[PDB]
Amino acid sequence: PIRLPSPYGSDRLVQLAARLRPALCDTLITVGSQEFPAHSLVLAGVSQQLGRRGQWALGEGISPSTFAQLLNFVYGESVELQPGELRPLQEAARALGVQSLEEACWRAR
Amino acid sequence: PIRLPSPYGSDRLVQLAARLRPALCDTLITVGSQEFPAHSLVLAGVSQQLGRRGQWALGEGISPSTFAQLLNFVYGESVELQPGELRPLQEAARALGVQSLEEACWRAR
């Protein structure tokens, strides 16, 4: 597999938030049928577009499998991917403004 | 005046939260008549006791003036105090479990 290192694994509050979730989560992002709790503050720290509270639906041909990988990256976990998973992740990171992930994907390609 | 340096002034997410507030705040702490918005996640990072979402009232003979100083410290601002303000701040930090502030107060005394 391909491994993408996350530059967020050593922010002390991001670490704490990763251990807590779903506790204290104020955001619920909905992807087709699947539900993802998150901390609006953590999201704001990586992308102004994503820093919003409450429930909302993501609709742009982004799969739950791809969104789960983007969300782990944001919470400081390295991501490990199969070959055909890189391009959909890059496209999701572009559309949602997560610049650090977009560039990691384009590097591994 | 006496100055207490805060050890939180360089956590990148705490800095961002300090610039945002009251935006994205999920907690409202009520002190007599006065209202203080906060991020439950930031509070959890300094004291397990304070890491809770929603509205709640603080009642323990803690003044709004003293609570405002404790909250600024938690968000990374140094605090500047008059002589008779140190002991009430120390007592508030003891009761709410903010250990870093309790010890800074006892040092300046």
UniProtKB/Swiss-Prot annotation, chains A, B:
Predominantly expressed in testis. Some isoforms are ubiquitously expressed. It comes from Homo sapiens. Disulfide bonds: none annotated. Homodimer (via PTB domain). Interacts with the N-terminal of FANCC. Interacts with ZBTB16. Interacts with GATA3. It is found in: Nucleus. The gene is ZBTB32. Residues 25-83 form the BTB domain. DNA-binding protein that binds to the to a 5'-TGTACAGTGT-3' core sequence. May function as a transcriptional transactivator and transcriptional repressor. Probably exerts its repressor effect by preventing GATA3 from binding to DNA. May play a role in regulating the differentiation and activation of helper T-cells. The C-terminal zinc finger domain functions as a transcriptional transactivator. Belongs to the krueppel C2H2-type zinc-finger protein family. This is Zinc finger and BTB domain-containing protein 32.
